[PDB]
């Protein structure tokens, strides 16, 4: 009934409290649960939901055979209530997509689902599940987008898409979407930057995006912009490097740190003045563990000193993609935009001996109150029957 | 839309009528049903729901292997409609928790879910499924709470939490929670009392809690308090001892009866003037059977004389935890707060030869009208193929 204002700033936050956990894979041992990946969260003014990409197959069935290329015509984007297992019986269909995004504007859901061939992919935009627009690949090379929630403000929702090489210069676009129709589109001019899999959030009527540099940066690149798509760019300066893989922590850069800069994971961070809350794997070579770190001058300064770290998943357990999501005043009752986050806990291939690959998920929400480090890992015993 | 007044007294009640039974374990023989425990009930102004703790695993699947410690990071608090099997397909996610409580204030649900390490557990409070507060362990020793419904009155909800040893003096707190934010917290001064797993209910704008003494009492301890957390304390005087294990009935005490006072079960009772309705196992050594007893002067007097007993589960059948829950006028239409109760019927370990441990549930509601003794046991044939 009413569009989200998005005009307040981010809630101050001293730590992260556990919010959900689905246990998908443990349950899927016997239940009817989808093989999934990219399990992001996004919230309405009424409820929070997890969105995900199915291969269109169930844990412990032959069609979970992972020989299928990542971008198949079977892949679809679906959603289920937060913390429930993604099951064919409790899940809503959203889009035919092998790359996706989603957000609610206070009135309805927007979804963005990219399918088609590598040289000609089309994003289809729906608003209340009705197709409202489309956009074709413009560099003819794997049009792709966030794998997490877009950000809405003042009745407009905002996303980032990338088309081009994943290991060289590519083309980056920001879009302003209104009621599921693209109303503005800007190609960023960012030579020597790589933007992929952006985690965008709203904060005082502007959007900020922390993304993945898959070409040559082990710190994360950021882009931020207002409702007119007047933008700025950079990289997180903290020497607590955010990507994976990455070197050991040392003096950072405000441009891409080339050292172990190739490849990466979807990740996120939250800006607070000159400070930054950083989410990252614990391992430096591999997608293992997860910790949150507060670096008071980390956004704009290049040292290693941080004030506090909070454990989320032990170094010895499997993690994967991570992403931002927020809860607005319109949902929470607060005077500020509450930052949360979710973590994909990848099981199966390539690191273990199975024919398949599936995520479980955890999430936390930031609070300015008591919290504790722990490990909340997937917990499925592998391999399975199949 | 309107907060529960909680100002009327408890409905007079001559016996207990059957309300629900889920048959979880019989059905789970084939269905997709969670391994569960702590299966308590709580009611809104619109519907009653059963809440429960999953290990995140299904009956007849390898992950039901009960080698997992009780307080794992896989444990979560979920709910399903009353009398339906707790299934991944029909259940709502609530909190990541290995100890929990829940109640509705007339406007929304509050949930309380404790997770984290033994030396640093955090309770996370949600209101309409939004995190609204948290509280850390203050004795650094297994912060834990009711395993049944909190009690709400006049827009405030009330609970009890314990931190410390389970076999010596510990620390007991009562809390006043308002819209999911803790607004008052009192540490009770009760030397030589042990409070655990409290069954609290409202009655004339005050809360009364009957709990478990796991240190040295086979009668149950009580604490009662008003909205300002001005409290009083004692133990149920009746010589019809309430806990399990316990001695044979003889003269009671208004302090802890040390005889067979170690260990126990979650239980409940309802106060009526000097009288008491007592729920208890039938066996004196083991968690078998269940009966309700009316002892007219049992709250404040120490003899064995009771006026009536009503059978619920035969001595020969398995039982387990039990707990209060009530139905307000705002739900029922009545001028009084109706007392009900639920019984966990534990199957599997440690008493039987399975790798797992799961509850079924039954419930009854008090009426001032005709009723009958019977036995309504679990009825699953053990073991299962796993």
């Amino acid at each position: 009934s009413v569009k989200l204002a998005g005009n307040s700033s981010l809630c101050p936050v001293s730590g992260w409290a556990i919010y959900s956990k689905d246990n998908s894979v443990r349950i899927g041992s016997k239940g009817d649960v989808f093989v999934i990946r990219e399990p992001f969260i996004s919230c309405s003014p009424l409820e929070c939901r997890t969105f995900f990409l199915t291969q269109g197959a169930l844990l412990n069935d032959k069609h979970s055979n992972g020989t299928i290329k990542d971008r198949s015509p079977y892949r679809t984007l679906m959603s289920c209530p937060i913390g429930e297992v993604p099951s064919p019986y409790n899940s809503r269909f959203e889009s035919v997509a092998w790359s996706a995004s989603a957000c609610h504007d206070g009135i309805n859901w927007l979804t963005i689902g990219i399918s088609g061939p590598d040289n000609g992919a089309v994003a289809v935009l729906k608003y209340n599940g009705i197709i409202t627009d489309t956009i074709k690949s413009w560099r003819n090379n794997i049009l792709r987008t966030q794998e997490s929630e877009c950000a809405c403000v003042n009745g407009s929702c905002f996303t980032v898409m990338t088309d081009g090489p994943s290991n060289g210069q590519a083309s980056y676009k920001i879009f302003r979407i209104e009621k599921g129709k693209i109303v503005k589109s800007v190609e960023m001019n960012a030579p020597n930057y790589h933007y992929e899999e952006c985690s965008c959030y709203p904060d005082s009527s502007e959007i900020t995006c922390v993304c993945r540099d898959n070409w040559h940066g082990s710190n994360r690149p950021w882009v931020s912009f207002n409702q007119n798509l007047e933008y700025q760019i950079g990289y997180i300066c903290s020497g607590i490097f955010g990507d994976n893989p990455r070197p050991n922590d040392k003096t950072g850069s405000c441009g891409p740190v080339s050292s172990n800069g190739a490849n990466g994971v979807k990740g996120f961070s939250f800006k607070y003045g000159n400070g930054v809350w950083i989410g990252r794997t614990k391992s430096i070579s591999s997608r293992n563990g997860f910790e949150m770190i507060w670096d008071p001058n980390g956004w704009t300064g290049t040292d290693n000193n941080f004030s506090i770290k909070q454990d989320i998943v032990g170094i010895n357990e499997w993690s994967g993609y991570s992403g931002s999501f927020v809860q607005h005043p319109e949902l929470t009752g607060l005077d500020c935009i509450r930052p949360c986050f979710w973590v994909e806990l990848i099981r199966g291939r390539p690191k273990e001996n199975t024919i398949w690959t599936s995520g479980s998920s955890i999430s936390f929400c930031g609070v300015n109150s008591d919290t504790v480090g722990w490990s909340w890992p997937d917990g499925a015993e592998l391999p399975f029957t199949i | 839309s309107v907060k529960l007044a909680g100002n009327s007294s408890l409905c007079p009640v001559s016996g207990w009528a059957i309300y629900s039974k889920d048959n979880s374990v019989r059905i789970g023989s084939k269905g997709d049903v969670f391994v569960i425990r702590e299966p308590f009930i709580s009611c809104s102004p619109l519907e009653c729901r059963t809440f429960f703790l999953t290990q995140g695993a299904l009956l007849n699947d390898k992950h039901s292997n009960g080698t997992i410690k009780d307080r794992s990071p896989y444990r979560t608090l979920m709910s399903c409609p009353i009398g339906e099997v707790p299934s991944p397909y029909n259940s709502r996610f609530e909190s990541v928790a290995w100890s929990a409580s829940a109640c509705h204030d007339g406007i929304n649900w509050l949930t309380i879910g404790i997770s984290g390490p033994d030396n640093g557990a955090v309770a996370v409070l949600k209101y309409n499924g939004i995190i609204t507060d948290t509280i850390k362990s203050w004795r650094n020793n297994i912060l834990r709470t009711q395993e049944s419904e909190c009690a709400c009155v006049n827009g405030s909800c009330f609970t009890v939490m314990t931190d410390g040893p389970s076999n010596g003096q510990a620390s007991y707190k009562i809390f006043r929670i308002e819209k999911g934010k803790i607004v008052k917290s009192v540490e009770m001064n009760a030397p030589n009392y042990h409070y655990e797993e409290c069954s609290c209910y409202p009655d004339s704008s005050e809360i009364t809690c009957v709990c478990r003494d796991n240190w040295h009492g086979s009668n149950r301890p009580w604490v009662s308090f008003n909205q300002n957390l001005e409290y009083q304390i004692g133990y149920i005087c009746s010589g019809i001892f309430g806990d399990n294990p316990r001695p044979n009935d003889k003269t009671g005490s208004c302090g802890p009866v040390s005889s067979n006072g170690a260990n126990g079960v979650k239980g409940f009772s309802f106060k009526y003037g000097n009288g008491v309705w007592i729920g208890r196992t039938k066996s004196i050594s083991s968690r078998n059977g269940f009966e309700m007893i009316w002892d007219p002067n049992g709250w404040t007097g120490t003899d064995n004389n009771f006026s009536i007993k009503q059978d619920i589960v035969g001595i020969n059948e398995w039982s387990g935890y039990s707990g209060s829950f009530v139905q307000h006028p705002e739900l029922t239409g009545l001028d009084c707060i109706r007392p009900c109760f639920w019984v966990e019927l534990i199957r599997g370990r440690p008493k039987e030869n399975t790798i797992w441990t799961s509850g079924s549930s039954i419930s009854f509601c008090g009426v001032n009208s005709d009723t009958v003794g019977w036995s309504w046991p679990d009825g699953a044939e053990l073991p299962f193929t796993i």
């Epitope: 101050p12 004030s307 008591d370 | 803790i182 607004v183 009192v186 540490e187 001064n189």
Partner: antibody, heavy 124, light 107 residues
Amino acid sequence: QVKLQESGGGLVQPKGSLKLSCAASGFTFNTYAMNWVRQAPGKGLEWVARIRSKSNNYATFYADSVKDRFTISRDDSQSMLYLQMHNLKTDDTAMYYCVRPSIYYYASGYLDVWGAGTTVTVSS
Amino acid sequence: QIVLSQSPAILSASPGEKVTMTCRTSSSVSYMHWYQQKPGSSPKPWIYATSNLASGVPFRFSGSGSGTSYSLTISRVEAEDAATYYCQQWNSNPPTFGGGTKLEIKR
């Protein structure tokens, strides 16, 4: 571990100036109001000043005994709290403490962390 | 401007005795906090919101009261308990502390 290491103390003449500092670690300094409380030799405790968080506009409050002479401030990006003292008097001689208050709504005013403190002597 | 008066100023007790120290207010407050100071160290947070014990405080301690009268009690005093206990309120600006009660061991 949450810690507050203050510094800046010392000997200074009546009418003089001093800038006490406090380095905080172990928590998110930016989310918290902060306090200075002091203690004259042998004499007990006296709150002096309070500054609030960014999200409450860094609002400042002072004890009358210190009003118009002391200024409180913070640099969140460095986790520092400051107390500038001007026009010192022999009365202001005291042990000065950096003090975090409890975030608990149900215990407003509880001061949950103290530093070791820094010593101030005002004498000619 | 809200005043706190603690009594007695000094209190002598044999180990094992029960002792109580009191803190009165010029006008009403919701609750009282207390701190423990030994000479040569910072106060320690001892109790909050009248009755809640700080981590590390042993069960011998308990705290009570309401309106304008509060107290701190030690069921069986031990020698390590010898210190000065200060009460403190923050119901209204400014926050204020009592004058302290100094606990001494008899022998």
